[PDB]
Amino acid sequence: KLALKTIDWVAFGEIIPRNQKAVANSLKSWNETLTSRLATLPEKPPAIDWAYYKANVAKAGLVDDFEKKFNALKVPIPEDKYTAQVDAEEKEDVKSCAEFLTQSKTRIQEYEKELEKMRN
Amino acid sequence: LHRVYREVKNRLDYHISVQNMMRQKEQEHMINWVEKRVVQSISAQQEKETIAKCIADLKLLSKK
């Protein structure tokens, strides 16, 4: 079972600069593609009627050999060598997060200070 | 996972397809071999020219 950070798409639409809409588009479709894909690609494949094959063979314990070999062959799960995003994120927080937010707050302060005066 | 399945099953099915082909072939030459031994039975055996006039005169009759 997978974890999958939930996602509201209209927000995602609203955070991409225009010069980057391209990327964002491809990112969306891949997701959709990928999703469709998993809907159709089953967790595991059909089993294998070993008895039947054992029932119709000719080379001796080939089937026995195979059933054994099949089971307790552990297929590797692919390394996630791909989360450099975590990094590209933390980076854009240096950027977006703090820097902008800090300045926005300060501007909201002065505005407020400016409404202060005007009350008197 | 799917690939392992397909490939193994594929190796298995090969044996069946082969086996099946052998059977067919052989039983071709087998039932066909029948032909050339029966074309030898009538062409030869002058006593298979008697079993000719036989079964055949049993045609005219029945029909009528």
Side-chain angles (χ1 to χ4, degrees):
Chain A
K1 16 225 95 294
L2 298 165
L4 271 189
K5 200 120 172 229
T6 295
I7 271 158
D8 95 276
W9 290 95
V10 14
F12 169 87
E14 319 317 332
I15 62 176
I16 321 294
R18 281 187 191 189
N19 41 294
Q20 303 230 322
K21 169 206 169 185
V23 172
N25 294 333
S26 160
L27 229 34
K28 249 258 235 305
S29 34
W30 194 230
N31 180 291
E32 283 155 9
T33 285
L34 274 174
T35 310
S36 329
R37 182 52 172 155
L38 287 133
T40 88
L41 252 204
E43 328 287 43
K44 298 186 191 166
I48 282 167
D49 191 359
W50 295 102
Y52 160 73
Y53 287 99
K54 192 174 140 204
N56 305 248
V57 65
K59 261 287 170 211
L62 187 86
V63 191
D64 304 331
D65 189 44
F66 283 29
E67 187 173 3
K68 276 170 201 180
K69 274 165 182 166
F70 176 90
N71 319 313
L73 175 93
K74 317 231 152 187
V75 175
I77 315 158
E79 290 197 50
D80 174 0
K81 40 193 197 226
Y82 326 94
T83 310
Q85 31 286 2
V86 157
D87 355 357
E89 168 164 32
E90 116 177 355
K91 201 54 200 233
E92 94 123 45
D93 319 358
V94 201
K95 279 308 129 194
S96 104
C97 171
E99 183 71 341
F100 175 90
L101 300 174
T102 314
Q103 292 164 19
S104 192
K105 278 166 206 215
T106 200
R107 250 177 294 123
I108 177 263
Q109 284 200 3
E110 41 202 349
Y111 282 152
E112 299 214 309
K113 175 149 187 178
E114 194 54 5
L115 297 181
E116 175 94 50
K117 286 173 209 192
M118 275 169 65
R119 167 197 128 205
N120 304 359
Chain B
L1 291 202
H2 284 286
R3 154 164 180 213
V4 312
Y5 163 89
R6 173 203 310 113
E7 302 219 356
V8 153
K9 187 173 179 275
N10 170 248
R11 304 272 259 250
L12 265 19
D13 288 345
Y14 168 98
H15 288 277
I16 289 168
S17 300
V18 161
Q19 275 159 36
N20 289 2
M21 179 243 71
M22 295 202 149
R23 281 147 25 136
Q24 207 181 13
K25 232 222 151 204
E26 290 181 307
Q27 285 168 348
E28 294 184 24
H29 211 108
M30 196 158 85
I31 54 190
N32 199 330
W33 186 44
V34 180
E35 293 211 19
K36 255 188 177 184
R37 274 189 67 173
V38 187
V39 164
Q40 277 191 340
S41 62
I42 56 176
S43 65
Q45 299 184 42
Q46 311 162 30
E47 295 198 4
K48 286 226 165 186
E49 306 146 358
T50 179
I51 62 185
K53 311 199 177 204
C54 288
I55 7 176
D57 276 310
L58 299 163
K59 289 174 170 174
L60 279 162
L61 317 168
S62 50
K63 274 251 181 175
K64 315 191 199 189

